[PDB]
Design a protein around this ligand. Structure first.
Ligand SMILES: [Mg+2]
Ligand SMILES: [Mg+2]
Ligand SMILES: [Mg+2]
Ligand SMILES: [Mg+2]
Ligand SMILES: [Mg+2]
Ligand SMILES: [Mg+2]
Ligand SMILES: [Mg+2]
Ligand SMILES: [Mg+2]
Ligand SMILES: [Mg+2]
Ligand SMILES: [Mg+2]
Ligand SMILES: [Mg+2]
Ligand SMILES: [Mg+2]
Ligand SMILES: [Mg+2]
Ligand SMILES: [Mg+2]
Ligand SMILES: [Mg+2]
Ligand SMILES: [Mg+2]
Ligand SMILES: [Mg+2]
Ligand SMILES: [Mg+2]
Ligand SMILES: [Mg+2]
Ligand SMILES: [Mg+2]
Ligand SMILES: [Mg+2]
Ligand SMILES: [Mg+2]
Ligand SMILES: [Mg+2]
Ligand SMILES: [Mg+2]
Ligand SMILES: [Mg+2]
Ligand SMILES: [Mg+2]
Lengths: 386, 67, 136
RNA sequence: CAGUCAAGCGUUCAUAGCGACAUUGCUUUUUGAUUCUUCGAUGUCGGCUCUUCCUAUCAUACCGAAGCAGAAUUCGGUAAGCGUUGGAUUGUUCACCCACUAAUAGGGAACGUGAGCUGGGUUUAGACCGUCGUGAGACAGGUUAGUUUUACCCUACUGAUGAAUGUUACCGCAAUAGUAAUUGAACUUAGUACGAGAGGAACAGUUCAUUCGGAUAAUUGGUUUUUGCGGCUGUCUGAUCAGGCAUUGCCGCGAAGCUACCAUCCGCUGGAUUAUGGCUGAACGCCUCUAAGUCAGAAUCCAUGCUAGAACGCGGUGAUUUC
RNA sequence: UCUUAAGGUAGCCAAAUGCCUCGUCAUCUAAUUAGUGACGCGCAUGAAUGGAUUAACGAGAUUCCCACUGUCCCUAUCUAC
RNA sequence: UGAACAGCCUCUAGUUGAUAGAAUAAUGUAGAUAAGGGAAGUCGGCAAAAUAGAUCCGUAACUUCGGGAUAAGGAUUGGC
């Protein structure tokens, strides 16, 4: 017979399969539509998720109850040290899809970037790009010819850049290499932009800007093998259920004599690649500046790093990106930040944001103070003090 | 913004932190965390707890401010 | 919410499912209120309709004068007793659940309010605000 | 369940909406008829949980007609994309009321689903009452108590490794398969259009909310074997300090992690169409959205985007062993 | 008025005994095929086939109320094997 | 300790026997805790939770006058 009472589904059928992602770094499967009018610039960036915090900002939305009144929101902080442009690759369109035809690398590579190419760096001759380096030492023989080959073809040009993992508190010691499509114009100019940037760094402030509407692309937090009840949010069976109750009672009818692909079943949860859209940047921090957490109303010399450092991460000595909301992926994970695909007015994507105060209290518990100067001022002197 | 003062322990309460409690007689009590809130629910006298600011002032500890 | 809903309110945590007994906060002579429905609530399998601060509900008097017994009437919740987060960033809650009696238009049957009332409920029903003593 | 004809109803008027007398069909969600398969056994009602499908569409999207001034309503089309509830009584399917909602539409999948649950009913053996029988006993008459077994095999499904493709590593492409967002309210429009008045909208805009989904732990709450700190009982170590035991001795707080519409954030825009309304324009010197041609258009379809990446699809790139 | 050997008296009841039946009225609930109190031409109650009531007692059946609680809204976490 | 050959700890005496090692996924078995609500779940409060000792106060209808009765409902409890 039919279902006694109609109820919506559980989970999302468009997010299958819920298997582990291919790699720890999520891959950007689409880039903003290119217009050959603006100057050549990146369309994405690489960063690391440090942690979340609490921000206080005066909401400005005509008609709303809290218009011109104070609200409290939670944002996540992403450490974004500048990346190094090492190598560009061109893509020629084919009736079978886009295909890379050539790759031109930089003459010199840092130690951290080439560690990606070795599964055992400690016992190795470290002969990476050594003979490719010999392609240089002549003016332009083997390289400029390849660059010209890219110019004559390769309607889409992407740039290979790698993070400076040594600048982060992580003990990773291995860089992350990724591609970013350039959305300037006159692809001949695109490769000129890339070649001039070989062995050169690019700061995050040259890509993203305050109040800009961006997107986050990262692999979520894995959780191993998971029961059906929590993997899909199904109803728990009654208490007096034999042979367990954290299950799904009926997984299919007699016909078809198979288990449907749309029935919730136990399997690995998390560690999937996700693309979270519509996240608004609030502050573009600069590592070469104290008082990172100081607003025009706070005016206290305190960095974005809380007391005792970010939980499980450390400090934010580098430039950082802090975006409203929460982005997928846990702390210490590589995260790729992307420009918005389409222009969105929405009267909230055009909102101008100016912060008031940053919660720098220690996240290792119910923190009370914001600065050891304040802590000493409040508690007074102690036995440890002389 | 205006930083709050805890009703039980006097600790400074920053925006978005702690819990606010309104008693039936319309008096409001703000607790910086669950620790102070729970002790308040057990009718513990702030004067008898050794780390509250009220106790410290009452017992003249670190009171070198006023002469 | 409903006919008397003058404006909109932000979402607040539900703390009063149906079947709850709630204190009567006016002078109409009712002692408690029994929830049987919530105005504006959605539908879902096995999901009990739940009431929050400022929500108009279909309530029934369980203790009070007999002419208020045995009949259903609208009501408006004025105290929640379950913590909810205001968008200014604070979590607040009263010590008990409380509400009043009102017609479908929102005109309160009683004339006075005992105890404090929530600012969300007062800001939304003008009539409740007028008779409210202390608003928070 | 749907037609065909049209005596009448409908102030006049068959067909706005109905429609008698007749007549043609469709479906197998009723109940019948037959006994074709199963009696060396296919686990029978109902409820709970869950998935998908059908459309004879309840609402939501867009339209057509009226005995459509407005509002409300009724008939109809494209439409199964999305949703269709919480309760009182009954074992109930069914039924009847309370209430919310946009609505509380109808069905199938061995009258879906018992090695998924329950056992309230039916449907063993105990027992009671009424009627019947002299009697043993009978009663789709009523009542109460009455064991719910096994998956380690194959396939299916969800996840997870994996040889051979000179070796290894890195960066990619995208065939294919899946796909998602949904709905309501309030203000403004506007007490305006419309109407004698009674009453009384809509388009654009704004703030939110319902249901659903993917994440996340800054805050709040929960969780305590951090056995982290403190306190308390009985006993044991001559006493103190410090500790053991009481299957974590008990209580208060309790970081980290996990976690909650009990917490926070987020959930895109292009084309082609359906119904329908139009253009030019013959057929048919007139006329006609149609015959050729053609314009706009639905929550429709395909795309943008999102997910997996063919483990016998592909590309670029680094290095590529010398007792 | 026919008829039996006598024609259900005292009592009791939609009761564990009533098909029609979810009987009718009141109460109980917002809503009750449940419960209780009444009515009784009672298919088919009824007197040691024992009728009616009954304090106390009951791992007997049924209804409601208070306190209580993860039974549930709506799930989450921890420990041992 | 305590009313107590109750439960809990110890002395005399007797054992240290039950295949082990390493991790801490899902579902389990056993033990638990949960904010707001409080039976709305369910055939049915099934299970679980709540109360509990002792001292003092107070204790209804009904009744076979014996009971009901620990009725119900309250207050106290340590150490010196
Ligand atoms: Mg259905
Ligand atoms: Mg979740
Ligand atoms: Mg069982
Ligand atoms: Mg923390
Ligand atoms: Mg806590
Ligand atoms: Mg249910
Ligand atoms: Mg047969
Ligand atoms: Mg047979
Ligand atoms: Mg056989
Ligand atoms: Mg079988
Ligand atoms: Mg149709
Ligand atoms: Mg059938
Ligand atoms: Mg079924
Ligand atoms: Mg089966
Ligand atoms: Mg029997
Ligand atoms: Mg017998
Ligand atoms: Mg006989
Ligand atoms: Mg029979
Ligand atoms: Mg496709
Ligand atoms: Mg916790
Ligand atoms: Mg024309
Ligand atoms: Mg008899
Ligand atoms: Mg003694
Ligand atoms: Mg003893
Ligand atoms: Mg053994
Ligand atoms: Mg139910």
């Amino acid at each position: 017979s039919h279902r006694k009472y109609e109820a919506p589904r559980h989970g999302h059928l468009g997010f299958l399969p819920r298997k582990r992602a291919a790699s720890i770094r999520a891959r950007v499967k689409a880039f903003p539509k290119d217009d050959r009018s603006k100057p050549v610039a990146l369309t994405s960036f690489l960063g690391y998720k440090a942690g979340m915090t609490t921000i206080v900002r005066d909401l400005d939305r005509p008609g709303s109850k809290f218009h011109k009144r104070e609200v409290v929101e939670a944002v996540t902080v992403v450490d974004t040290p500048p990346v190094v442009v090492v190598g560009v690759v061109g893509y020629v369109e084919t009736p079978r899809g886009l295909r890379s035809l050539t790759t031109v690398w930089a003459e010199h590579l840092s130690d951290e970037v080439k560690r990606r190419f070795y599964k055992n760096w400690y016992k190795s001759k470290k002969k990476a790009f050594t003979k490719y380096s010999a392609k240089y030492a002549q003016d332009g023989a083997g390289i400029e010819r390849e660059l010209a080959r890219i110019k004559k073809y390769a309607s889409v040009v992407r740039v290979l850049v790698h993070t400076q993992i040594r600048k982060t508190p992580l003990a990773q010691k291995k860089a992350h290499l990724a591609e970013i499509q350039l959305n300037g114009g006159s692809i001949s100019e695109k490769v000129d932009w890339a070649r001039e940037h070989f062995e050169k760094t690019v700061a995050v402030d040259s890509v993203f800007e305050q109040n800009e509407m961006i997107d986050a692309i990262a692999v979520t937090k894995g959780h191993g093998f998971e029961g059906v009840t929590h993997r899909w949010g199904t109803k728990k069976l009654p208490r007096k259920t034999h042979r367990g109750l954290r299950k799904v009672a009926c997984i299919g009818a007699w016909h078809p004599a198979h288990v449907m692909w749309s029935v919730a079943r136990a399997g690995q949860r998390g560690y999937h690649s996700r693309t979270s859209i519509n996240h608004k940047i609030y502050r573009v921090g600069k590592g070469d500046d104290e008082a990172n957490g100081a607003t025009s109303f706070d005016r206290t010399k305190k960095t974005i790093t809380p007391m005792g450092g970010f939980v499980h991460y450390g400090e934010i000595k580098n430039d950082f990106i802090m975006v409203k909301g929460c982005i997928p992926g846990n702390r210490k994970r590589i995260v790729t930040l992307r420009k918005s695909l389409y222009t969105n007015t929405s009267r909230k994507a055009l909102e101008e944001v100016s912060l008031k105060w940053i919660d720098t209290a220690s996240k290792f518990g119910k923190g009370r103070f914001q600065t050891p100067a304040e802590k000493h001022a409040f508690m007074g002197t102690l036995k440890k003090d002389l | 913004m205006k930083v709050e003062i805890d009703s039980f322990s006097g600790a400074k309460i920053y925006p978005g932190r702690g819990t606010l409690f309104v008693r039936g007689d319309s008096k409001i009590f703000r607790f910086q965390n669950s620790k102070s809130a729970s002790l308040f629910k057990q009718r513990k006298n702030p004067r008898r707890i050794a780390w509250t600011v009220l106790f410290r002032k009452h017992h003249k500890k670190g009171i070198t401010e006023e002469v | 919410s409903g006919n008397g809903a003058q404006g909109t309110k932000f979402r607040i945590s539900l703390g009063l499912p149906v079947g709850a007994i709630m204190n009567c906060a006016d002078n109409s002579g009712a002692r408690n209120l029994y929830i049987i429905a919530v105005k504006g609530s959605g539908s879902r399998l096995n999901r009990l309709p739940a009431a929050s601060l400022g929500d108009m509900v279909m309530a029934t008097v369980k203790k009070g004068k007999p002419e208020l017994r045995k009949k259903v009437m609208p009501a408006i919740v004025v105290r929640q007793a379950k913590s909810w987060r205001r968008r200014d960033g604070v979590f607040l809650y009263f010590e008990d659940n409380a509400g009043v009696i009102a017609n479908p238009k929102g005109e309160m049957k009683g004339s006075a309010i005992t105890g404090p009332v929530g600012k969300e409920c007062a800001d939304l029903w003008p009539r409740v605000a007028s008779n409210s003593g202390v608003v928070v």
